[PDB]
Amino acid sequence: GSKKCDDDSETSNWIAANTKECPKCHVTIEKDGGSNHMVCRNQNCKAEFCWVCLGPWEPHGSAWYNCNRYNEDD
Ligand SMILES: [Zn+2]
Ligand SMILES: [Zn+2]
Cα 64 to middle of ligand 2, angstroms? 12
Q: How was this structure determined?
A: NMR
For 4-61, the DSSP string reads S-S--TTT-TTHHHH--B-TTT--B-----SSSEEE---TTT--EEETTTTEESGGGT
Q: Given the DSSP bridges, would you call strands 55-56 and 48-50 parallel, antiparallel or unpaired?
A: antiparallel
Q: Put residue 73 in one of left, alpha, beta given phi > 0 → left and psi -120 to 50 → alpha.
A: alpha
**Closest ligand (CA of 67):** 2
**Closest ligand (CA of 56):** 2
Domain range for 72: 1-74
Q: How many CB atoms lie within 10 A of CB 27?
A: 14
Q: Is residue 40 within 8 Å of 47, Cβ to Cβ?
A: yes
Q: How many CB atoms lie within 10 A of CB 15?
A: 16
Cα 6 to middle of ligand 2, angstroms? 28
Q: How many CB atoms lie within 10 A of CB 5?
A: 7
Angle at 24 between CA 23 and CA 30, to 5 degrees: 55
Chain center to CA of 25 = 12
Tally the domains of the chain: 1
Q: Is residue 37 within 8 Å of 46, Cβ to Cβ?
A: no
Cα 8 to middle of ligand 2, angstroms? 28
